[PDB]
Amino acid sequence: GVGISTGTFNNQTEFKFLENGWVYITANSSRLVHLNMPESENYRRVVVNNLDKTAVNGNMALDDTHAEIVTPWSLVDANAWGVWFNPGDWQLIVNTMSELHLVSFEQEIFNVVLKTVSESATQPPTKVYNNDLTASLMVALDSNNTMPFTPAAMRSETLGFYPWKPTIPTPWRYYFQWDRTLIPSHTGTSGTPTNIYHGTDPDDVQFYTIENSVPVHLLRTGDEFATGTFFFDCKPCRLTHTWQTNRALGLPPFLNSLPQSEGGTNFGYIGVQQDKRRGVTQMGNTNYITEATIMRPAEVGYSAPYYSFEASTQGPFKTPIAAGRGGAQTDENQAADGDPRYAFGRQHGQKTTTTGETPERFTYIAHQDTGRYPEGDWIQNINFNLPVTDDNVLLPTDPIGGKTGINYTNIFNTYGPLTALNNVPPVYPNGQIWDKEFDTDLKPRLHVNAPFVCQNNCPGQLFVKVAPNLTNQYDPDASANMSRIVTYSDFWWKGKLVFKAKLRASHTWNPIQQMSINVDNQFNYVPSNIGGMKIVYEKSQLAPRKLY
Amino acid sequence: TIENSVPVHLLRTGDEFATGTFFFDCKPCRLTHTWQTNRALGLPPFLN
Ligand SMILES: [Mg+2]
C-alpha cells in the first residue's frame, strides 16, 4: 500500500565459482529513475530534412534526412556494459577468464512515486511539489518483440553507469519509411545534383502503437512490476585475442644458419636460394618460395572498401567493416579496419563535473591482429618478372579513375570462402551487450555493435509513460490543448543479468597482458575533490590465444 | 540413357502409373517483404 516499500535496492556483483572452473557471474543493478510527462499525449510522424547541409556538394556524407514516428513513451534500455559492471568487476572478468556466456536476464520496477508540481505558491513566488497518491505510472513490456528494436546503446542513451546517481529513460522512437535520392558530387561540380525526398512507399508503411500491441500495467505507489526470468541462447564471447596473420601460420622455414652472438642485427639466415627451396605455393609460375609466397591454409581477415558509401531507397550509408587491428607499431587505418568510435556524455563515462555540451570520445582499437594495412597491399602481373616494372604492378600509390587520392584498395574486397574472422570484442563500458538478429532469410555472420546476438528471440523492450493526469477542464471534442496537471514520477529499477564464464589457464612460460593501475591511469577510478567522476574505455581480449 | 538407368513401365489403355508420395523438407518461404535499409535500423536520433 502507500507507506510500504515494494522492493529492494541491489547493485551487487556476485561471482560464484563452481567445479571445473565454471563461474556464475550474477550482476545485479539498481537505479533511481526520473520521468516527466510527455510533451504531448500524441503519436507524430516527423520528417527530418537537411538540404541546408547536403546541397553543399561534396557534403553527401552529411546527410541526416529521415522520417520518424514520435511516441509519448520512454524506453528503459539497460543494454550496455556500464550498467552491470564497475571497472573492478570488469578487471576480474577480463584478466582471469577465457570466455563468457550470456545466461539470463530479469528486471522489475518498484517503489513508485508520482508527484504533481503545480506550482505558484507564493511571492518570489516559488514552486511546490505534492504527492499524487492516486496517480498511476504506465508500464508496458513488449515480450513478444512486437515492436521495432531500438537499442539505446548506439546513441549513448541507456541508463546511468553510476549506482548512486539517479537517471532517466529516453523518449522512445522509431524509423518510419521514406523514399530518398541523393546523387554524389564534389566541390568543383556545378549545377545542382539531384537531392530530393520523394515521400512514402505505401507498401512499406508500419505505424506502431504501444497501446494496441502490448498490455499496459498501471502502477500506483504501492504496486510493483516484475518481468519473468528470460533465458538466452547464443554463442560464447571469447576474452582472448588472436595475434597471427597469414605470415605466421604453420611451420617456419628451417634456418641453416643460426646467429652466434647476441644483439640487434645478429640475424639468422634461411640459407637456401629462394628458387631452390622446398615447399608449396599457389603461384604456378615461379619456383620462388618466400614467406609472402608460401601457401597458408586459409586467409585471416579480409579487405574492404573504405570509405565506401552505398545507397538504396532511403539514401546513402557507410559500408561497415569487420576486422581490426591491422597496423603494426602505433599506425592503423582506423577506417580500413572499421575501428569504432564512441561518443558519450557524463551519464555514461565523461567527467560529471565537465561543463559544456561537447561529448567525450574514443576509438576502440582491438587487440586481435586480424585487420589490414592497405598501404602495404599490391598486385603484380601474372608474369611475375621481378624486380617488377611499373607497368606490371598496381600500387596503392597509383591513382584510379584519374583521382589523386584514390587507389585500388579503396574499392578492394578480398572476402571469400577462405576468409577467417573473429567476432567483435566487447567495448567496456559503452558497448552494447546483446542485439536482436535480423529477420532476413539469410543472416550476418556477426554484428559490429554487440558480441551476443539472439537468433532465438531477444528480451522485450520496457516502456514507461506517466498517466494522463487531467484537470477538470477537459473537452476532447475541442482542438485546443490538452490541459493536464503537471505530473512526473520517480521509480526504482532493478535488474539481474547472469553470465556463465570459464577460467583461463597459463600455457606459456611468459606472463601476459592484463589490466591494472599504474601511476598513470590511477585517477580515472576514483572521484574528485567535488563529486567526481569518470569511467574510462578499457579493452577486453587481453590474453593471447592461438590461431593455428 | 533412360534405358540403362531407370525402370521403364509399359502402359496400355487399361494401365496406370502412380508415384509414391514424396515428402519435402526445406526452410519456409516467407510471404512478407522487408523495407528497412541500413538507413533505417534501430533508434532514430532524438529531435529537439
Ligand atoms: Mg597486436
Coordinates of C-alpha atoms and ligand atoms in Angstrom, one line a residue:
Chain A
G1 CA 0.0 0.0 0.0
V2 CA 1.0 3.6 0.5
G3 CA 3.7 3.6 3.2
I4 CA 5.1 0.2 2.4
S5 CA 8.1 -0.4 0.0
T6 CA 7.7 -2.9 -2.8
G7 CA 11.3 -3.8 -3.5
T8 CA 15.0 -3.9 -2.7
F9 CA 17.9 -1.9 -4.0
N10 CA 20.8 -4.2 -5.0
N11 CA 23.8 -3.3 -7.2
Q12 CA 25.9 -6.1 -6.1
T13 CA 28.0 -8.4 -8.3
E14 CA 28.4 -12.0 -7.2
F15 CA 31.0 -14.4 -8.5
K16 CA 30.0 -17.9 -7.7
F17 CA 32.8 -20.4 -8.5
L18 CA 31.8 -24.0 -9.3
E19 CA 33.7 -27.1 -10.3
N20 CA 35.9 -27.5 -13.4
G21 CA 36.4 -23.7 -13.5
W22 CA 33.0 -22.6 -14.5
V23 CA 32.0 -19.4 -12.9
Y24 CA 28.5 -18.0 -12.4
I25 CA 28.6 -14.2 -12.6
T26 CA 25.5 -12.7 -11.3
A27 CA 25.5 -9.0 -12.0
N28 CA 22.8 -7.1 -10.1
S29 CA 22.0 -3.5 -11.0
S30 CA 19.7 -0.9 -9.5
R31 CA 18.9 2.7 -10.3
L32 CA 16.6 5.5 -9.2
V33 CA 14.7 6.7 -12.3
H34 CA 13.2 10.1 -13.2
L35 CA 10.5 10.6 -15.8
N36 CA 8.3 13.5 -16.8
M37 CA 5.0 13.6 -18.6
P38 CA 5.1 13.5 -22.4
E39 CA 5.4 16.8 -24.4
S40 CA 2.0 15.8 -25.9
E41 CA 0.0 12.6 -25.5
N42 CA 0.1 12.0 -29.2
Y43 CA 2.0 10.0 -31.8
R44 CA 3.6 12.1 -34.5
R45 CA 5.1 11.5 -37.9
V46 CA 8.0 13.9 -38.2
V47 CA 10.4 14.3 -41.1
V48 CA 13.9 15.5 -40.9
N49 CA 15.5 17.1 -43.9
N50 CA 18.8 18.9 -44.1
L51 CA 19.1 20.3 -47.6
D52 CA 20.8 23.0 -45.6
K53 CA 23.9 20.9 -45.4
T54 CA 23.6 18.4 -48.3
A55 CA 23.1 21.0 -51.1
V56 CA 26.7 22.0 -50.4
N57 CA 28.2 19.5 -53.0
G58 CA 30.9 17.3 -51.5
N59 CA 28.7 17.1 -48.5
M60 CA 26.7 13.9 -49.2
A61 CA 28.2 12.2 -46.2
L62 CA 26.5 14.8 -44.0
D63 CA 23.0 13.6 -44.9
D64 CA 20.6 13.3 -41.9
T65 CA 17.4 13.1 -43.9
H66 CA 14.8 10.7 -42.5
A67 CA 11.3 10.1 -41.2
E68 CA 10.3 9.1 -37.7
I69 CA 7.2 8.3 -35.5
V70 CA 7.1 10.3 -32.2
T71 CA 5.9 8.5 -29.2
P72 CA 4.6 9.6 -25.8
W73 CA 6.5 6.7 -24.4
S74 CA 10.0 6.5 -22.9
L75 CA 12.4 3.5 -23.2
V76 CA 14.2 1.9 -20.4
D77 CA 17.2 0.3 -22.1
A78 CA 20.0 -1.2 -19.9
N79 CA 21.8 -2.8 -22.8
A80 CA 25.3 -1.6 -22.2
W81 CA 28.2 -3.0 -20.2
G82 CA 28.4 0.0 -18.0
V83 CA 25.0 -0.7 -16.4
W84 CA 26.2 -4.0 -15.0
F85 CA 29.9 -3.7 -14.1
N86 CA 32.2 -1.2 -12.4
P87 CA 35.8 -1.3 -13.5
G88 CA 36.8 -3.6 -10.7
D89 CA 34.3 -6.3 -11.8
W90 CA 35.5 -5.8 -15.4
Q91 CA 39.1 -6.2 -14.3
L92 CA 38.3 -9.5 -12.8
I93 CA 36.4 -10.9 -15.7
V94 CA 38.9 -9.9 -18.4
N95 CA 42.1 -10.9 -16.6
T96 CA 41.1 -14.3 -15.4
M97 CA 38.6 -15.8 -17.7
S98 CA 38.8 -17.2 -21.2
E99 CA 35.2 -16.9 -22.4
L100 CA 31.7 -15.7 -21.4
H101 CA 28.1 -17.0 -21.9
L102 CA 25.0 -15.0 -21.6
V103 CA 22.6 -16.9 -19.4
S104 CA 19.6 -15.0 -18.1
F105 CA 18.1 -11.6 -17.7
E106 CA 15.3 -10.3 -15.5
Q107 CA 14.0 -6.9 -14.2
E108 CA 11.5 -5.2 -12.0
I109 CA 10.1 -1.7 -11.2
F110 CA 9.3 -0.8 -7.6
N111 CA 8.6 1.9 -5.0
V112 CA 6.8 4.1 -7.5
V113 CA 6.2 7.7 -6.6
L114 CA 4.1 10.2 -8.5
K115 CA 4.2 13.9 -7.6
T116 CA 2.5 16.9 -9.1
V117 CA 4.3 20.2 -9.4
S118 CA 1.6 22.9 -9.5
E119 CA 3.1 25.4 -8.8
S120 CA 2.7 29.1 -7.9
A121 CA 2.9 29.4 -4.1
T122 CA 3.6 32.4 -3.1
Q123 CA 5.6 35.6 -3.6
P124 CA 9.0 35.4 -5.3
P125 CA 6.7 33.1 -5.9
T126 CA 8.4 29.7 -5.6
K127 CA 7.4 26.2 -6.6
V128 CA 5.9 23.4 -4.5
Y129 CA 5.7 19.7 -5.1
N130 CA 2.9 17.4 -3.7
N131 CA 2.3 13.7 -3.8
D132 CA -0.5 12.4 -6.1
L133 CA -1.1 9.1 -4.3
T134 CA -3.9 8.0 -6.6
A135 CA -1.8 8.7 -9.7
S136 CA -0.5 5.9 -11.9
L137 CA 2.7 5.1 -13.8
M138 CA 2.1 3.2 -17.0
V139 CA 4.4 0.3 -17.7
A140 CA 4.4 -1.9 -20.7
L141 CA 6.6 -4.8 -21.6
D142 CA 6.9 -5.9 -25.2
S143 CA 7.8 -9.5 -24.5
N144 CA 6.7 -10.6 -27.9
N145 CA 9.2 -8.2 -29.6
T146 CA 6.1 -6.9 -31.5
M147 CA 7.8 -3.5 -31.9
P148 CA 10.9 -2.2 -33.6
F149 CA 14.1 -2.9 -31.8
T150 CA 15.7 0.4 -30.8
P151 CA 18.8 -0.3 -28.7
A152 CA 19.8 2.9 -27.0
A153 CA 23.4 2.0 -26.9
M154 CA 24.0 3.5 -30.3
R155 CA 23.0 6.9 -29.1
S156 CA 24.5 6.6 -25.7
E157 CA 21.0 6.8 -24.3
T158 CA 20.9 3.9 -21.8
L159 CA 20.6 4.2 -18.1
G160 CA 23.3 5.7 -16.0
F161 CA 26.6 3.9 -15.2
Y162 CA 26.6 5.1 -11.7
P163 CA 24.5 3.4 -9.0
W164 CA 24.4 6.3 -6.5
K165 CA 23.5 8.9 -9.2
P166 CA 19.9 8.9 -10.4
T167 CA 19.0 8.6 -14.1
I168 CA 16.4 8.7 -16.8
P169 CA 14.9 6.8 -19.7
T170 CA 14.9 8.3 -23.3
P171 CA 11.9 9.3 -25.3
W172 CA 11.2 6.3 -27.4
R173 CA 11.0 6.5 -31.1
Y174 CA 11.4 4.5 -34.4
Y175 CA 12.0 4.7 -38.1
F176 CA 9.1 5.2 -40.5
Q177 CA 9.5 4.5 -44.2
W178 CA 10.6 7.2 -46.7
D179 CA 11.9 7.2 -50.3
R180 CA 15.0 9.4 -50.9
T181 CA 17.6 10.2 -53.6
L182 CA 20.8 11.9 -53.3
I183 CA 23.5 11.9 -56.1
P184 CA 27.1 12.4 -55.1
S185 CA 29.3 15.3 -56.2
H186 CA 32.4 17.3 -55.3
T187 CA 33.3 21.0 -54.6
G188 CA 34.2 21.6 -58.2
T189 CA 30.9 20.2 -59.5
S190 CA 28.5 22.9 -60.5
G191 CA 24.8 22.8 -61.3
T192 CA 22.7 21.2 -58.6
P193 CA 23.0 17.5 -58.2
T194 CA 19.5 16.0 -57.6
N195 CA 18.7 15.9 -53.9
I196 CA 15.1 15.0 -53.2
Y197 CA 12.8 13.5 -50.7
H198 CA 10.1 11.6 -52.7
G199 CA 7.8 10.6 -49.9
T200 CA 6.4 7.4 -48.6
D201 CA 6.2 4.0 -50.3
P202 CA 2.7 2.9 -49.1
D203 CA 3.6 -0.7 -49.4
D204 CA 6.1 -0.1 -46.6
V205 CA 4.1 1.8 -44.1
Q206 CA 4.1 0.5 -40.5
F207 CA 2.7 2.7 -37.8
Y208 CA 3.1 1.0 -34.4
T209 CA 1.5 1.9 -31.1
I210 CA 2.2 0.5 -27.6
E211 CA -1.4 0.7 -26.7
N212 CA -2.6 -1.7 -29.5
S213 CA 0.3 -4.1 -29.2
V214 CA 1.3 -4.5 -25.6
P215 CA -0.7 -4.9 -22.3
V216 CA -0.2 -1.9 -20.2
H217 CA 0.1 -2.1 -16.4
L218 CA -0.9 0.8 -14.2
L219 CA 1.3 1.1 -11.1
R220 CA 0.4 3.2 -8.2
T221 CA 2.7 3.9 -5.2
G222 CA 2.0 0.5 -3.6
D223 CA 2.3 -1.6 -6.7
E224 CA 5.2 -3.3 -8.3
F225 CA 6.0 -4.8 -11.7
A226 CA 8.4 -7.7 -12.4
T227 CA 9.2 -9.4 -15.6
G228 CA 9.9 -13.1 -15.6
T229 CA 13.4 -14.5 -16.0
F230 CA 14.4 -14.6 -19.6
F231 CA 16.9 -17.2 -20.7
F232 CA 19.3 -16.6 -23.5
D233 CA 20.8 -18.8 -26.1
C234 CA 23.8 -17.6 -28.1
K235 CA 27.4 -18.4 -28.8
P236 CA 30.1 -17.7 -26.3
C237 CA 32.0 -14.5 -26.5
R238 CA 35.7 -15.1 -26.0
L239 CA 38.0 -13.0 -23.9
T240 CA 41.3 -13.7 -25.8
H241 CA 42.7 -12.0 -28.9
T242 CA 44.5 -13.8 -31.7
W243 CA 47.7 -12.4 -33.0
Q244 CA 48.7 -14.5 -36.0
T245 CA 48.3 -13.1 -39.5
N246 CA 48.9 -15.3 -42.5
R247 CA 52.7 -14.6 -42.2
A248 CA 52.9 -16.7 -39.1
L249 CA 50.8 -19.9 -39.8
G250 CA 52.4 -23.2 -39.6
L251 CA 55.9 -24.4 -39.8
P252 CA 58.5 -21.6 -40.1
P253 CA 61.3 -22.3 -42.6
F254 CA 64.3 -24.2 -41.3
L255 CA 67.3 -22.0 -40.6
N256 CA 70.6 -23.5 -41.8
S257 CA 72.5 -20.6 -40.3
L258 CA 72.0 -19.6 -36.6
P259 CA 73.4 -16.4 -35.1
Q260 CA 76.4 -16.8 -32.8
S261 CA 76.4 -13.6 -30.8
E262 CA 73.5 -11.7 -29.1
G263 CA 72.5 -8.3 -30.4
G264 CA 70.2 -6.2 -32.6
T265 CA 71.3 -7.2 -36.1
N266 CA 72.7 -10.6 -35.5
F267 CA 70.1 -12.2 -37.7
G268 CA 69.7 -15.8 -38.6
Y269 CA 69.5 -16.9 -42.2
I270 CA 67.4 -19.5 -44.0
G271 CA 70.5 -20.3 -46.1
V272 CA 68.8 -21.5 -49.3
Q273 CA 68.3 -19.8 -52.6
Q274 CA 64.8 -18.6 -52.9
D275 CA 64.3 -20.6 -56.1
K276 CA 65.9 -23.9 -54.9
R277 CA 63.6 -24.3 -51.9
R278 CA 61.2 -27.0 -51.0
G279 CA 57.5 -26.3 -50.1
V280 CA 54.1 -25.4 -51.6
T281 CA 52.8 -22.3 -53.2
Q282 CA 49.8 -21.2 -55.2
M283 CA 51.9 -19.5 -57.8
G284 CA 52.1 -21.8 -60.8
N285 CA 54.9 -19.7 -62.4
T286 CA 57.9 -19.2 -60.2
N287 CA 60.0 -21.6 -58.2
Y288 CA 60.4 -18.7 -55.7
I289 CA 59.3 -19.8 -52.2
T290 CA 59.2 -16.8 -49.8
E291 CA 57.2 -16.1 -46.7
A292 CA 54.9 -13.8 -48.7
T293 CA 54.6 -16.6 -51.3
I294 CA 54.4 -19.8 -49.3
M295 CA 50.9 -21.3 -49.1
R296 CA 48.9 -20.7 -46.0
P297 CA 46.0 -22.9 -45.1
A298 CA 43.5 -20.1 -45.5
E299 CA 43.2 -16.3 -45.0
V300 CA 43.0 -14.5 -41.8
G301 CA 40.9 -11.4 -42.3
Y302 CA 39.6 -9.7 -45.3
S303 CA 40.0 -6.4 -47.2
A304 CA 37.1 -4.0 -47.5
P305 CA 36.0 -0.8 -49.3
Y306 CA 36.7 2.4 -47.4
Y307 CA 35.3 5.0 -47.0
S308 CA 32.7 3.2 -49.1
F309 CA 29.1 4.5 -49.2
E310 CA 26.3 2.6 -50.8
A311 CA 22.7 3.7 -51.5
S312 CA 19.3 2.2 -51.5
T313 CA 15.8 3.7 -51.4
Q314 CA 16.4 5.7 -48.3
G315 CA 19.7 7.2 -49.0
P316 CA 23.4 6.6 -48.6
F317 CA 25.2 4.8 -45.8
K318 CA 28.7 3.8 -44.9
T319 CA 29.8 0.2 -45.7
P320 CA 30.6 -1.4 -42.4
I321 CA 33.9 -3.3 -41.7
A322 CA 34.5 -6.3 -39.6
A323 CA 38.1 -6.8 -38.7
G324 CA 40.9 -4.8 -36.9
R325 CA 43.6 -4.4 -35.7
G326 CA 45.7 -4.3 -38.9
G327 CA 48.5 -1.9 -38.4
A328 CA 51.9 -2.5 -36.9
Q329 CA 53.5 -0.3 -34.3
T330 CA 51.1 2.6 -33.5
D331 CA 49.8 3.1 -37.0
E332 CA 46.4 1.7 -38.1
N333 CA 44.0 2.6 -40.9
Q334 CA 41.1 3.3 -38.4
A335 CA 38.7 3.3 -41.4
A336 CA 40.1 0.3 -43.3
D337 CA 39.7 -1.8 -40.2
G338 CA 36.4 0.0 -39.4
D339 CA 37.6 0.7 -35.9
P340 CA 34.6 2.1 -34.0
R341 CA 34.4 5.5 -32.3
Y342 CA 32.2 6.1 -29.3
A343 CA 30.7 9.4 -28.2
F344 CA 29.0 9.9 -24.9
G345 CA 28.2 12.2 -22.1
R346 CA 28.6 12.4 -18.3
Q347 CA 25.9 9.9 -17.5
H348 CA 27.9 7.3 -19.4
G349 CA 31.6 8.0 -18.7
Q350 CA 32.6 11.6 -19.3
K351 CA 33.7 13.6 -16.2
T352 CA 30.5 14.6 -14.4
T353 CA 31.9 17.9 -13.5
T354 CA 32.6 19.0 -17.1
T355 CA 30.5 21.8 -18.3
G356 CA 29.7 22.4 -22.0
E357 CA 27.8 20.4 -24.5
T358 CA 30.8 18.8 -26.2
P359 CA 30.9 15.0 -25.7
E360 CA 33.8 12.7 -24.7
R361 CA 35.0 10.3 -27.3
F362 CA 37.4 7.4 -28.0
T363 CA 38.2 5.0 -30.7
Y364 CA 38.4 1.3 -29.8
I365 CA 41.4 -0.4 -31.2
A366 CA 41.1 -4.1 -30.7
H367 CA 44.0 -6.3 -29.7
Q368 CA 43.2 -9.0 -32.3
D369 CA 45.6 -8.6 -35.2
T370 CA 43.2 -9.5 -38.0
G371 CA 42.8 -6.3 -39.9
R372 CA 44.7 -4.8 -42.9
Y373 CA 47.3 -2.2 -43.7
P374 CA 46.2 -1.2 -47.2
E375 CA 49.3 0.9 -47.7
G376 CA 51.2 -2.3 -47.8
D377 CA 49.0 -4.1 -50.4
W378 CA 49.8 -4.6 -54.1
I379 CA 49.1 -6.5 -57.2
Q380 CA 51.6 -7.9 -59.7
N381 CA 51.2 -9.0 -63.2
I382 CA 50.7 -12.7 -64.0
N383 CA 54.3 -13.0 -65.3
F384 CA 56.0 -12.3 -62.0
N385 CA 59.0 -10.9 -63.8
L386 CA 60.8 -9.3 -61.0
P387 CA 62.1 -6.7 -59.8
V388 CA 58.8 -5.7 -61.1
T389 CA 58.3 -2.9 -63.7
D390 CA 55.9 0.0 -63.0
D391 CA 53.5 -1.3 -65.8
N392 CA 53.3 -4.8 -64.3
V393 CA 52.3 -3.7 -60.8
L394 CA 49.4 -1.8 -59.3
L395 CA 50.3 0.1 -56.2
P396 CA 48.1 1.9 -53.6
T397 CA 50.0 4.9 -54.8
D398 CA 48.8 4.7 -58.4
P399 CA 45.7 6.8 -58.9
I400 CA 42.4 5.2 -60.1
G401 CA 39.9 6.7 -62.5
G402 CA 42.1 9.8 -62.6
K403 CA 41.7 10.8 -58.9
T404 CA 44.8 11.6 -57.0
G405 CA 43.5 10.5 -53.6
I406 CA 42.0 7.2 -54.6
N407 CA 43.8 3.9 -55.2
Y408 CA 42.5 0.4 -55.8
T409 CA 42.5 -0.5 -52.1
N410 CA 39.6 1.8 -51.6
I411 CA 37.3 -0.4 -53.7
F412 CA 39.1 -3.6 -52.9
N413 CA 37.4 -6.7 -51.4
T414 CA 39.1 -10.0 -50.6
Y415 CA 36.3 -11.7 -48.7
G416 CA 36.0 -15.2 -49.8
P417 CA 35.5 -18.8 -48.9
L418 CA 38.9 -18.9 -47.2
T419 CA 38.3 -15.8 -45.1
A420 CA 38.5 -16.3 -41.3
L421 CA 37.2 -13.9 -38.7
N422 CA 36.7 -13.2 -35.1
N423 CA 33.6 -11.6 -33.6
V424 CA 33.6 -8.0 -32.3
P425 CA 35.2 -7.6 -28.9
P426 CA 33.2 -6.1 -26.1
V427 CA 33.7 -2.4 -25.6
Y428 CA 33.6 -1.5 -21.9
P429 CA 31.8 0.5 -20.7
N430 CA 29.8 2.0 -23.6
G431 CA 29.4 -1.1 -25.8
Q432 CA 26.1 -2.8 -26.4
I433 CA 25.9 -6.3 -24.9
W434 CA 23.3 -8.2 -26.9
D435 CA 21.5 -7.4 -30.1
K436 CA 18.4 -8.8 -32.0
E437 CA 19.1 -10.8 -35.1
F438 CA 17.9 -9.5 -38.5
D439 CA 14.7 -11.1 -39.7
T440 CA 16.2 -11.7 -43.1
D441 CA 16.1 -15.2 -44.6
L442 CA 19.9 -15.2 -44.6
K443 CA 21.8 -13.7 -41.7
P444 CA 25.1 -11.9 -41.0
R445 CA 27.9 -13.9 -39.6
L446 CA 28.1 -11.3 -36.9
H447 CA 27.1 -7.8 -35.8
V448 CA 29.5 -4.9 -35.2
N449 CA 27.7 -3.3 -32.2
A450 CA 27.5 -6.3 -29.9
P451 CA 29.1 -9.7 -29.3
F452 CA 25.9 -11.5 -28.2
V453 CA 23.2 -12.0 -30.9
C454 CA 19.9 -13.5 -30.2
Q455 CA 18.8 -15.7 -33.1
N456 CA 16.3 -17.1 -30.6
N457 CA 14.2 -14.2 -29.6
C458 CA 15.6 -11.3 -27.6
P459 CA 14.2 -9.9 -24.4
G460 CA 11.4 -7.5 -24.9
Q461 CA 11.7 -3.8 -24.5
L462 CA 10.4 -2.0 -21.5
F463 CA 8.4 1.2 -21.9
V464 CA 7.2 3.7 -19.4
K465 CA 4.9 6.8 -19.5
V466 CA 3.2 9.0 -17.0
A467 CA -0.5 8.6 -16.9
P468 CA -2.6 11.5 -18.2
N469 CA -3.4 13.5 -15.1
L470 CA -6.3 15.5 -16.2
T471 CA -7.6 18.9 -14.9
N472 CA -11.4 19.5 -14.5
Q473 CA -11.1 21.3 -17.8
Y474 CA -11.2 18.7 -20.5
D475 CA -13.0 18.6 -23.8
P476 CA -11.7 16.0 -26.2
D477 CA -14.1 17.3 -29.0
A478 CA -12.1 20.5 -28.8
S479 CA -8.9 21.1 -30.9
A480 CA -7.5 23.2 -28.1
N481 CA -4.6 21.9 -26.0
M482 CA -4.9 19.1 -23.6
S483 CA -4.7 20.8 -20.2
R484 CA -3.2 18.3 -17.9
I485 CA -1.9 18.6 -14.3
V486 CA 1.9 18.9 -14.5
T487 CA 3.0 15.5 -13.3
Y488 CA 6.1 13.4 -13.0
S489 CA 7.4 10.2 -11.5
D490 CA 10.3 8.7 -9.6
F491 CA 10.7 5.0 -9.7
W492 CA 13.4 2.4 -8.9
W493 CA 14.6 -0.2 -11.3
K494 CA 16.4 -3.4 -10.5
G495 CA 17.9 -5.8 -13.0
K496 CA 19.7 -9.1 -12.8
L497 CA 22.0 -10.3 -15.7
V498 CA 23.5 -13.6 -15.3
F499 CA 26.6 -14.8 -17.1
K500 CA 28.5 -18.0 -17.1
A501 CA 32.2 -17.8 -17.7
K502 CA 35.2 -20.1 -17.7
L503 CA 38.6 -19.5 -16.1
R504 CA 41.7 -19.2 -18.3
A505 CA 44.9 -21.1 -17.8
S506 CA 48.7 -20.5 -18.1
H507 CA 50.1 -22.3 -21.1
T508 CA 53.2 -20.3 -21.7
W509 CA 56.5 -19.6 -19.9
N510 CA 55.9 -15.9 -20.3
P511 CA 53.2 -13.9 -18.4
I512 CA 50.6 -11.9 -20.4
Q513 CA 48.7 -8.7 -21.0
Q514 CA 46.3 -7.8 -18.1
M515 CA 44.7 -4.7 -16.6
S516 CA 46.0 -2.8 -13.6
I517 CA 46.9 0.5 -12.1
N518 CA 49.6 2.2 -12.8
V519 CA 50.9 5.5 -11.5
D520 CA 49.4 6.8 -14.7
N521 CA 45.8 5.7 -15.1
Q522 CA 45.2 5.6 -11.3
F523 CA 43.0 8.7 -11.2
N524 CA 40.2 7.5 -13.5
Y525 CA 38.9 5.1 -10.9
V526 CA 38.2 7.4 -8.1
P527 CA 36.0 10.5 -7.6
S528 CA 37.4 14.0 -7.3
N529 CA 37.5 16.9 -4.9
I530 CA 34.0 17.5 -5.9
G531 CA 31.6 14.8 -6.7
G532 CA 33.8 13.1 -9.3
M533 CA 33.6 11.3 -11.7
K534 CA 34.7 9.4 -14.8
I535 CA 34.5 6.0 -16.4
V536 CA 37.1 5.1 -18.9
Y537 CA 37.3 3.0 -22.0
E538 CA 39.1 -0.3 -21.3
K539 CA 39.5 -3.1 -23.8
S540 CA 38.6 -6.8 -23.3
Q541 CA 40.5 -9.5 -25.1
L542 CA 43.8 -9.0 -23.3
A543 CA 45.1 -12.5 -23.3
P544 CA 46.7 -14.1 -26.4
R545 CA 45.1 -17.2 -28.0
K546 CA 46.4 -19.3 -30.9
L547 CA 45.0 -19.4 -34.4
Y548 CA 46.9 -22.3 -35.7
Chain B
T1 CA 20.3 -43.2 -71.3
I2 CA 16.9 -43.5 -69.7
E3 CA 17.0 -47.2 -70.5
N4 CA 20.1 -48.1 -68.6
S5 CA 19.3 -46.1 -65.6
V6 CA 15.5 -46.1 -64.9
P7 CA 13.0 -48.9 -64.7
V8 CA 10.5 -48.4 -67.6
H9 CA 6.8 -49.2 -67.3
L10 CA 4.8 -50.0 -70.4
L11 CA 1.2 -48.6 -70.1
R12 CA -1.6 -49.8 -72.3
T13 CA -5.1 -48.4 -72.2
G14 CA -6.2 -50.1 -69.0
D15 CA -2.9 -49.4 -67.3
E16 CA -2.0 -46.5 -64.9
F17 CA 1.2 -45.4 -63.2
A18 CA 1.3 -43.7 -59.9
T19 CA 4.2 -42.4 -57.9
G20 CA 4.5 -42.6 -54.1
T21 CA 4.1 -39.5 -52.1
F22 CA 7.3 -37.6 -51.8
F23 CA 7.8 -35.6 -48.7
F24 CA 9.9 -32.5 -48.8
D25 CA 11.7 -30.7 -46.1
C26 CA 13.2 -27.3 -46.8
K27 CA 13.2 -24.0 -45.0
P28 CA 10.0 -21.8 -45.2
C29 CA 9.4 -19.3 -47.8
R30 CA 8.0 -16.1 -46.4
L31 CA 5.2 -14.0 -47.8
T32 CA 6.3 -10.7 -46.3
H33 CA 8.7 -8.1 -47.6
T34 CA 11.3 -6.2 -45.5
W35 CA 11.5 -2.5 -46.1
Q36 CA 14.3 -1.2 -43.9
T37 CA 17.7 -0.4 -45.5
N38 CA 20.7 0.4 -43.3
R39 CA 19.4 3.9 -43.1
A40 CA 16.5 2.7 -41.0
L41 CA 17.8 0.3 -38.4
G42 CA 17.4 1.0 -34.8
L43 CA 16.9 4.1 -32.7
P44 CA 16.4 7.3 -34.6
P45 CA 18.2 10.4 -33.4
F46 CA 16.3 12.4 -30.8
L47 CA 14.6 15.5 -32.1
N48 CA 14.9 18.6 -30.0
Ligands
MG1 MG 49.0 -6.6 -31.8

